[PDB]
Amino acid sequence: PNFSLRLRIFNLNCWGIPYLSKHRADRMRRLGDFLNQESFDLALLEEVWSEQDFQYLRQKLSPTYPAAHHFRSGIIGSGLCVFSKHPIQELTQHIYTLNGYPYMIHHGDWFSGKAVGLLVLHLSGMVLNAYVTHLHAEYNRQKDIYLAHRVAQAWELAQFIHHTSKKADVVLLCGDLNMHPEDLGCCLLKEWTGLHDAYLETRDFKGSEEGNTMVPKNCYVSQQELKPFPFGVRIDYVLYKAVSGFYISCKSFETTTGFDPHRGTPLSDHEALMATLFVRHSSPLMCVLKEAWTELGLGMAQARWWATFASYVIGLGLLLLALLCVLAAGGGAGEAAILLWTPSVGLVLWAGAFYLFHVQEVNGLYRAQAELQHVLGRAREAQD
Amino acid sequence: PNFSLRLRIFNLNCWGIPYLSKHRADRMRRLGDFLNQESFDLALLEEVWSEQDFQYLRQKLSPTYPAAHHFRSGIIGSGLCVFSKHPIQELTQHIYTLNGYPYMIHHGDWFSGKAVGLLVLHLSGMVLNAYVTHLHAEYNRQKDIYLAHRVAQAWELAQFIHHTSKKADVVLLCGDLNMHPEDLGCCLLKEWTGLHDAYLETRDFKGSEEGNTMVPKNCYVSQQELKPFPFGVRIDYVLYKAVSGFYISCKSFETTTGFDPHRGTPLSDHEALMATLFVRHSSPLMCVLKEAWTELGLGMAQARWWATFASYVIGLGLLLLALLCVLAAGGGAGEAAILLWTPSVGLVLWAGAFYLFHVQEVNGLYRAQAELQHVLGRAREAQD
Ligand SMILES: CCCCCCCCCCCCCC
Ligand SMILES: CCCCCCCCCCCCCC
Ligand SMILES: CCCCCCC
Ligand SMILES: CCCCCCC
Ligand SMILES: [Mg+2]
Ligand SMILES: [Mg+2]
Numbered sequence: 195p196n197f198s199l200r201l202r203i204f205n206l207n208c209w210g211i212p213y214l215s216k217h218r219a220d221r222m223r224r225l226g227d228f229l230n231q232e233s234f235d236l237a238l239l240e241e242v243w244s245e246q247d248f249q250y251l252r253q254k255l256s257p258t259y260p261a262a263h264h265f266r267s268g269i270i271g272s273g274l275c276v277f278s279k280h281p282i283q284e285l286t287q288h289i290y291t292l293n294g295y296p297y298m299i300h301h302g303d304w305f306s307g308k309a310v311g312l313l314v315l316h317l318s319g320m321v322l323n324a325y326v327t328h329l330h331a332e333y334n335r336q337k338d339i340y341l342a343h344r345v346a347q348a349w350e351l352a353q354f355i356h357h358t359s360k361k362a363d364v365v366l367l368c369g370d371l372n373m374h375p376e377d378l379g380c381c382l383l384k385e386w387t388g389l390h391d392a393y394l395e396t397r398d399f400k401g402s403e404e405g406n407t408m409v410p411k412n413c414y415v416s417q418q419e420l421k422p423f424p425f426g427v428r429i430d431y432v433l434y435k436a437v438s439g440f441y442i443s444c445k446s447f448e449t450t451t452g453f454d455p456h457r458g459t460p461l462s463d464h465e466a467l468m469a470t471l472f473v474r475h476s477s478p479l480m481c482v483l484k485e486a487w488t489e490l491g492l493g494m495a496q497a498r499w500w501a502t503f504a505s506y507v508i509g510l511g512l513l514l515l516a517l518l519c520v521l522a523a524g525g526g527a528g529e530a531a532i533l534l535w536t537p538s539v540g541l542v543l544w545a546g547a548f549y550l551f552h553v554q555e556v557n558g559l560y561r562a563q564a565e566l567q568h569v570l571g572r573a574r575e576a577q578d
Numbered sequence: 579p580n581f582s583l584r585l586r587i588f589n590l591n592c593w594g595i596p597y598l599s600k601h602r603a604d605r606m607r608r609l610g611d612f613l614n615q616e617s618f619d620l621a622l623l624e625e626v627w628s629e630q631d632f633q634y635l636r637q638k639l640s641p642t643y644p645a646a647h648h649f650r651s652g653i654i655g656s657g658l659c660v661f662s663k664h665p666i667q668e669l670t671q672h673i674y675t676l677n678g679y680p681y682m683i684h685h686g687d688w689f690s691g692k693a694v695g696l697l698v699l700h701l702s703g704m705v706l707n708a709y710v711t712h713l714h715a716e717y718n719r720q721k722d723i724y725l726a727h728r729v730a731q732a733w734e735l736a737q738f739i740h741h742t743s744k745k746a747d748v749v750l751l752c753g754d755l756n757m758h759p760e761d762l763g764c765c766l767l768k769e770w771t772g773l774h775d776a777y778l779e780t781r782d783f784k785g786s787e788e789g790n791t792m793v794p795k796n797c798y799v800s801q802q803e804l805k806p807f808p809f810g811v812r813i814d815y816v817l818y819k820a821v822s823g824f825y826i827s828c829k830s831f832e833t834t835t836g837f838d839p840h841r842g843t844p845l846s847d848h849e850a851l852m853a854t855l856f857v858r859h860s861s862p863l864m865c866v867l868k869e870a871w872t873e874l875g876l877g878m879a880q881a882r883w884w885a886t887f888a889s890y891v892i893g894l895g896l897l898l899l900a901l902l903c904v905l906a907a908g909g910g911a912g913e914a915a916i917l918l919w920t921p922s923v924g925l926v927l928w929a930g931a932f933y934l935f936h937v938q939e940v941n942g943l944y945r946a947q948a949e950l951q952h953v954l955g956r957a958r959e960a961q962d
Pocket of ligand 2 (some may be wrong): 938
């Protein structure tokens with residue numbers, strides 16, 4: 195027969211960080227009211243770190259959205275809340291192996307345990323796979339110590355979607371990639387999976403200039419962060435694809451322009467993305483993959499160097515400990531050898547933890563690089 | 579037309595641990611010779627921690643097996659080597675979130691970074707998904723602090739297979755589950771996925787009494803470990819299932835009886851599993867799931883208690899540090915306040931790391947429990 199489906203998709207990074215976000219409770223309340231009024235088919239909230247906030251929203255949005263799930267991983271949680279007016283048939287989560295560095299507390303991404311969540315919804319006889327994700331943040335554009343990490347996360351995300359979506363008719367990904375469209379990670383994910391950006395394909399667009407999710411107008415956003423880019427950055431995306439026999443088109447795409455759609459203070463530092471999708475029945479560029487392979491190799495070399503440096507520190511600490519024992523045994527100093535001894539022990543223990551973390555990082559980088567190399571090799575065989 | 583496929587599957591836990599395994603190099607050499615002579619379609623080796631050993635085997639088995647992959651995760655690596663006479667179309671890996679405790683060095687499973695690996699092989703127009711896995715070990719049968727961990731790992735393994743095998747005609751899992759057939763984890767995996775044990779369904783069985791992979795006869799196995807069970811334990815399995823339109827039967831299943839099939843010293847402490855599978859064209863028990871849900875909840879409660887205990891220790895250390903400063907400021911003791919100060923600082927740092935690890939563990943336990951609860955709830959809705 196004729197199949198027509200209308201999908202209302204809402205994506206918002208809620209910036210609900212406890213004790214670090216202004217007016218967090220008020221923003222949650224406004225968001226709940228907005229969602230109830232709109233009645234989106236699927237709403238994919240992000241950065242809701244507080245469990246209480248999820249429970250506040252789940253109870254508030256219960257009649258409109260009977261199905262709600264929160265993905266939890268890492269110390270502070272993944273932060274992914276998903277609300278659906280349709281019952282979720284299946285749930286699964288993939289957690290990225292290389293989420294940053296713990297010593298970089300000022301950044302703090304490592305404690306998040308970032309992940310990608312899969313929701314399977316069967317709508318009108320059509321399998322839909324929905325993915326919500328939050329990639330590692332970018333702190334300095336000019337120099338990135340997380341460039342390799344994000345590329346690996348993008349590759350793991352691409353692999354997860356490719357493997358788990360075999361039978362899904364429509365594949366939807368809504369997430370804060372944290373990368374520009376030009377950036378390698380976005381290209382790698384799109385080229386492999388085959389997903390298409392909603393903003394690029396929308397018949398009608400209403401909202402912030404250039405669809406930029408982070409905007410100077412928004413009060414919460416720091417001006418210094420957006421000083422390089424005058425109109426702000428587009429780092430949140432709605433990506434969609436359909437199998438043969440199914441055609442999906444993006445009728446209307448909308449953003450809220452740096453403010454609450456009720457003229458109130460913005461809901462979050464980021465910007466809401468609202469996409470209307472209509473579903474009607476009826477080769478990866480190896481250069482992109484090779485560039486990713488090269489970047490991962492550079493990252494691995496740096497990780498190996500850090501592990502080697504750490505091993506040297508452990509050795510130095512051990513030599514110092516031996517020297518301290520000699521001095522104590524001789525008794526020539528006659529004092530404070532014990533005092534110096536305890537910190538020296540701690541140095542060795544800490545340098546060992548640093549070394550172990552780096553060895554694990556090299557293994558993590560290798561896993562992504564090896565899979566990329568495998569794909570590249572097969573492509574070369576096909577070419578020849 | 580008529581489709582007939584013969585599959586020769588070999589599974590062996592190689593026990594190739596560097597500096598902890600007797601005759602490791604000799605055993606690797608014997609294994610390479612055996613594999614070359616046999617020419618198994620797929621060989622799924624396990625516990626090969628050394629990279630050099632993998633390279634030794636890959637070069638040796640290269641003409642017979644053009645395709646070989648090693649999965650690497652964690653500090654010491656996953657240890658999964660797979661050799662295939664057929665080119666591997668796709669590779670992906672899932673690493674279990676809750677692999678044990680690092681403080682339990684005597685056990686040492688945490689450093690392994692255990693994982694499940696997926697190999698996609700297209701054979702004669704038929705998609706085959708092959709999974710190799712190694713679950714957490716069991717140390718005391720009577721009391722398990724890893725009971726909850728293994729159940730969570732089994733659930734994550736079941737979910738991974740279920741989601742990634744949508745399009746696969748034949749699904750094969752060969753791994754060291756480390757659990758008896760009666761145990762909950764095996765039941766949970768089999769009930770969800772639908773996999774069938776080869777030993778149970780084999781037309782002909784040759785080998786050790788009761789198919790027990792770990793045997794008293796084998797010299798390497800410690801007698802104390804097998805003191806409770808007279809004939810040994812069956813903890814390695816070959817599990818297989820096929821989609822409708824495809825029928826798979828296990829013609830011959832074989833084990834090597836505690837020795838090298840050449841009458842030499844055994845290849846490993848464990849036992850080789852050799853299954854011949856013929857493929858010819860043409861509801862989960864909620865009680866098992868509910869039992870798993872209950873066990874995870876008990877584990878979570880223990881983890882929460884440990885985190886609370888750790889927080890108390892951090893507080894005590896801080897109070898001690900404050901007291902030490904007071905004494906130093908007063909100068910009444912006049913000595914050794916600095917000496918005592920440094921260890922007290924270390925206590926706080928270590929108790930904090932312990933606390934963070936436990937908070938992460940609670941989140942990990944929650945992820946498995948929430949998915950199980952979701953499935954149980956849907957089943958109840960169907961029942962009513
Ligand atoms: C996300 C994975 C992070 C794990 C970091 C590895 C650190 C190793 C610490 C080992 C502690 C040993 C205590 C006896
Ligand atoms: C497999 C995951 C293991 C991670 C263990 C978490 C330990 C947290 C340690 C934090 C270290 C902070 C250093 C400043
Ligand atoms: C995961 C432990 C890392 C500690 C690094 C201290 C420099
Ligand atoms: C991952 C760090 C755990 C340390 C525990 C020390 C008791
Ligand atoms: Mg943020
Ligand atoms: Mg072993």
